[PDB]
Amino acid sequence: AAKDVKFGNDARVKMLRGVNVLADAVKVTLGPKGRNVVLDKSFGAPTITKDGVSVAREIELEDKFENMGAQMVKEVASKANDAAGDGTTTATVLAQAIITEGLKAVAAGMNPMDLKRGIDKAVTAAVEELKALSVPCSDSKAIAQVGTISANSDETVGKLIAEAMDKVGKEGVITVEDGTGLQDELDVVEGMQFDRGYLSPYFINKPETGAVELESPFILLADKKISNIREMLPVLEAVAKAGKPLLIIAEDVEGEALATLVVNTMRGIVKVAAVKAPGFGDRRKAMLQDIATLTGGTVISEEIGMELEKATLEDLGQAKRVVINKDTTTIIDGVGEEAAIQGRVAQIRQQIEEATSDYDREKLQERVAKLAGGVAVIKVGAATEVEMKEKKARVEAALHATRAAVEEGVVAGGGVALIRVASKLADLRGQNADQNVGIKVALRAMEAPLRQIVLNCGEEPSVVANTVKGGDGNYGYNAATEEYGNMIDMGILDPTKVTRSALQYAASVAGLMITTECMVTDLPK
Amino acid sequence: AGGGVALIRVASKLADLRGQNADQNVGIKVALRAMEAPLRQIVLNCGEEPSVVANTVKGGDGNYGYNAATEEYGNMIDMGILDPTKVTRSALQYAASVAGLMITTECMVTDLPK
Amino acid sequence: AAKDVKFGNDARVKMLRGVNVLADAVKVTLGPKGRNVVLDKSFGAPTITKDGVSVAREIELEDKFENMGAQMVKEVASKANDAAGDGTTTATVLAQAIITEGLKAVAAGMNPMDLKRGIDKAVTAAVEELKALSVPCSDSKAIAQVGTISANSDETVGKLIAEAMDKVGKEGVITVEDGTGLQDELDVVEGMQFDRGYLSPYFINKPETGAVELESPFILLADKKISNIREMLPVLEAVAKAGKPLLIIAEDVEGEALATLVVNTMRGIVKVAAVKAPGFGDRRKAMLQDIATLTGGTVISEEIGMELEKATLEDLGQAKRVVINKDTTTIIDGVGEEAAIQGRVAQIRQQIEEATSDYDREKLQERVAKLAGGVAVIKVGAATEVEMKEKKARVEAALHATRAAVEEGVVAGGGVALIRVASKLADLRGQNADQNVGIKVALRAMEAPLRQIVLNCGEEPSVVANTVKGGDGNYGYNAATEEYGNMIDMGILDPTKVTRSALQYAASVAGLMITTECMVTDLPK
Amino acid sequence: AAKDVKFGNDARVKMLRGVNVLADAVKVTLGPKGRNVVLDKSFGAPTITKDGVSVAREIELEDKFENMGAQMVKEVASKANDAAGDGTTTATVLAQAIITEGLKAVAAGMNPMDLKRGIDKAVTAAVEELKALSVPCSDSKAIAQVGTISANSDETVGKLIAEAMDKVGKEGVITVEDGTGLQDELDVVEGMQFDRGYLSPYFINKPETGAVELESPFILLADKKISNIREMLPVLEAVAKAGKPLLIIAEDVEGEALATLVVNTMRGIVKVAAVKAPGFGDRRKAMLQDIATLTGGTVISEEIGMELEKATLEDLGQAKRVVINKDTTTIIDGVGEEAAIQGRVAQIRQQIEEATSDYDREKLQERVAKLAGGVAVIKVGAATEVEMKEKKARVEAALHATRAAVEEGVVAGGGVALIRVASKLADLRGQNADQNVGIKVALRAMEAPLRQIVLNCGEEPSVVANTVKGGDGNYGYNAATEEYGNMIDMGILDPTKVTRSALQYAASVAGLMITTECMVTDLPK
């Protein structure tokens, strides 16, 4: 209906002022000396937290425009978390910094399109100057130190992780279950994991992690699209019995039978979830077959004349547990006998011999790895339910950030990482003044994360920063101890992956906004 | 020659075209000066005075234009900057259709703001 | 009483918005393709003009602050006119240009104090790059061409001037009287001129020129300060008779007898005017003596026991006409007999022989020059009163601008002068970005004057400027003909002095304003 | 004080809307089928008239700007009347026409400065195309027909004029006095007339004509400026006796003794009036001498040592009547004896023999003419006071318009004159479209005057115009008879001088306004 449209300053100041809220309202839970943000709840008591993520989710403004802004940068930062395991709070505070100075420039008479390049250059450079500091993390000794710092100095964790990776390689699968009663457990089981997520939220039964979890469920393997729920019934009812939930893996599921299951397992009538099959094309119909052998089931395709109506509970796959992120599935321990599995491996092991191309080769070594190096399972320790559910968490967080260190290393955390990088590129230049500025902006805006935590401590950031700059190396300022030194030795660091993601995604958005001339939203009625 | 020149080119030749009464000669000048738009615009999305870039593309001939991306002139065709003819035509005609109708409208009838 | 006080943006935007009026309301009467500005009068018909000066005088805003700004820049430009003979309209439009971009900068985050330096450097440089183009004007042939272009191609004028300067040196005195009936007249008379102005306006009887004029007046020469009007009466009454006005030259005249005469010759009771004696110290009491011999009178000092009460009409000086600018007096043809004058010269001619220092020398060659090379008098031609009063004007304007060419040459007028200069200094830099910008601002702001006249012609300035830049030399754009070429040959030029003054004074102000943080005015009540 | 300033449309629409009143409120009293305009008076009854001049005087609007406009065009039209003897109403309606279409153009996107030229060309052309139709008026037969039509078909007048011109040449002086009792009288007396007006209004004792009249007054002839009223007393009192008024002729009279007499003859204490002497320079001191011999008095200059204090009533000039317009004096019958006058002529008659130049010659034949061909005096007829004062008027109006016919002929009046001219110049063109339009505008705007009178008759002007155009020659439309034919034969015509003046002055103004971008007036407080 009748829209409202704004251009120029207006269209932007709204965006700015709009993000300034999302920012200012998160840049406090920053660091160790971070403050509390109270998030009013409806029924019950307010929620008091310092989790910059939860504080974000609850942001949404009145003025349709301001909101629009604050709703974009909000949307991008969320991506950093999706990749690394943290940073979103950082991203957000970075973005704010660029945008604040960017728009301060644009409106001063400089070209937007250049300021965007100057910025992207200054970044593309700093992203590498950053890969410099990156200090490897390959030996299972250093892996321990990481997980140990991610669990708040709990040595028990660090080891647990290291012991796990040393069983399936730092490129393997790792899951965390619940404990059976004190004494941490660890063992390897036939499993798998592919890059597919849930088809729609709601299936979500654990809004804490933001994913789904089904125990001893049944799996549906059918090659084709599913719209007519009718095809389901003969199986959705054979699965109402035995009282076990169901997982759906097929070419896809559209609006009909989709919005159907989204409601049935919503009232509590047989819980089910679905996700697109793996990959596409001709290799799709093959990968899907592995999952079948892996879970003692059968593939249901139309190419051989099989219908979803003529399928009992025997033709279904089955495992002892499965998880499914926003964009990541993962099967744990399947019924498949080590006979048809070790044999399916032999068939694929030969597919590599009759290899005629490099591509055909790659996608085969991948298919095997996931199928032979099963999955790692860590059952957290214990001593009372309350403590068990707390360690479980610190483990996931640790394991996570660890993985991301193994990949691109780790670097002087706590805000230095950036001030360091950005202190070298002081000579970087572009083609026109309007681009040189697009840079200075991007640098001065990396001094933010630190300058902030130094502020959540009532200590003049003006200085603490100036001083961290007046040196070199991993020399930083420890937020907690209020004394300087080597940030790495002091145990203050973040995987490199994240300090990067946060710097890039922040840049992405800020850019777009600096190069925006028009906004179109509904009318305040 | 795409990227806005196509038009400025054509419209630069027809500088002698005339009609029957002043009120028609003007109906022309209007239509020409309005073809210098598309270019004059992209030249604006680059913060470069369109006033000039246009004037200069006019002060020549052939497929000589201004490359928006490179910020340097030359042969628009060689430089890989072009649009099928069909389109640069369609757009010029349909735009004309409408504008016409509106310029020859004396009455509008719509529901009441309630 | 209760003041209102503003700081920061506020204090400035008011100033800006305040000058934007004074500017935008004068930058139209610019050039040959200039428009008309109507200045409402009370009783009678509106005044229609294109004289950017008259349009200024009538500017004064409501909002005490906006007015404050517009009232400063207004005050400085007026100085250009005072020195050269034009430029004020230019100064004003220049000022606008700097300030508009300066404040656009300050408020963008740059240092004010630097922007001021960057600007002043960019100027101090361009001022010389300008003395380059300056093409001399010493031979009485080129002098003619100037006066001729200042009189709108009237050769008769150009000659008149040249013939005049060739009688008292290009460093002499020149005045324009009224004609006696066709046929231009020219002759030399015993006179003098010193750097002193009226003590207060009002004495002004010709608000057109803005000065005072007294015919066949009496002169008062007394060495001392005058506060008690009582001392005057014995002479102010001997001067009510004979019906001639009176000129006062004494050490000074303070609040008492001053605000006294300011009112007496206001009602029409004996017209009088006063001005500080010449120079100061010991040489003051001497210079003043020359004026006496020069005008057949006597000096009245307290050092010999002379009182202002005991002075008849015989002890008074007398001439046939005197003028007195804002800061310039000038005596024309005095009663002094060529006996005591040619003798006073002989006395001073020797003072130079017994010269012991370079200073003592200088101030003696000056005293003689003014006393020996009397004054030039040009009685304009005729043929009806209406035409006579029109040529008289074109002569003053011409003579004026000429003088200013003789001093610092002439240069490609009509806005090029500047675009030229400012096109070379493209490499000029300072110490910090915030100073480099203080420059770019000052250059881009010199392209204004032209960019404007090109606008009073409906021709895209964007181009006409770009094109005048894309060359070199005195190559410009003729506003009148709408065709390019050599601005000098085409007869389009302004004395160098002025194009300088206007650029400097404009700079002065803009500077101050860019370095202002507080404004203090009365309350809107 | 605090001014208000407007630019662009605003500055103009105000002016337009402002004139539209002055116009619309006068363009009705136009022609023979003209309507009545009621002009409220304070004390008494409203004034009902059709004299577009009187209706103008009483216009002055509220909105400072609209007024400004309506006050300019109002001021220029008044000039037409000053030269010719009519037209002001026409000028005003012309101006309106140009301005209305001009600004309609400017604001449409065309250049103002061009539109002004296009217009001025179209005029400069039409002004001549007009000198075509101009049909001579030299023979005392055609002169009669003119005066006769200017007196509303009263043959008696026409003759009176003709008989008068035939006594002092169509280049002589003619005045209208009051009658002595029926039977028109006519005779020649020693008099003179120069181009000088009253120094300030108020002296005006007959606000009907707008001039001054003194019977059997004394005259003051003094060569010099007069500021100190003191110099007067010894004579202003010798003139209080004898009870006769006084006329002042001197180099000039400034602020002092001026604002002095302006008040003394205001309370009724001895009526006096003053006017600048004739011409300037050296010939001024001579012309003034004639006036002396002419009026049996003596010249009072400072060059021979004469003071205004030492002058009785014998040294004063004297005549039997004098008149003084806005810019025209005129002496009637002086005491000078035909001895010193016929002798002064002989002295000047020789000045011509010893003639060395063409200029010196001219100004001598002029001095004699005015002095030898005295003045004509027409004492209107009678039969009751009321009718006598009515004929007197019709005579002045007639005599006037006649003079103006003798000079530049006469042409098809009643609005055709213009439509005719403007119908030929249909091919006239300029340099750019924006100038061709500046023409079309100026032509279509000449069809106004007619188009209007045709409207004050409820007859579609659309046609009557179209039809007068569709022919040629002096073929027009008679407003009164409502039938066409030869406008000259039908007795419908206006001196050429006026139809010109009105077309030019109207153009002048309209121009200026079309080329105005700024207005500056006081604040509505």
Swiss-Prot record, chain B:
Phosphorylated reversibly during heat shock. Can be UMPylated on a tyrosine residue by SelO/YdiU, probably under stress conditions. Each subunit is composed of an apical domain that binds non-folded proteins and GroES, an intermediate domain and an equatorial domain that binds ATP and is involved in inter-ring interactions. Forms a large central channel that appears to traverse the entire length of the cylinder with no obstruction. The central channel of GroEL functions as two cavities, one in each ring, that are separated from each other by the crystallographically disordered 23-amino-acid C-terminal segments of the seven subunits. The entry and exit of polypeptide seem to be restricted to the apical end of each ring. It is found in: Cytoplasm. Belongs to the chaperonin (HSP60) family. Signal peptide: none annotated. Together with its co-chaperonin GroES, plays an essential role in assisting protein folding. The GroEL-GroES system forms a nano-cage that allows encapsulation of the non-native substrate proteins and provides a physical environment optimized to promote and accelerate protein folding, probably by preventing aggregation and by entropically destabilizing folding intermediates. ATP binds at residues 3, 67-69, 83. This is Chaperonin GroEL. Forms a cylinder of 14 subunits composed of two heptameric rings stacked back-to-back. Interacts with the co-chaperonin GroES. Can form asymmetrical complexes, composed of one GroEL and one GroES, and symmetrical complexes, formed between one GroEL and two GroES oligomers. The asymmetrical complex is the functional unit. It was suggested that the symmetric heterooligomer may represent a transient intermediate in the chaperonin protein folding cycle.
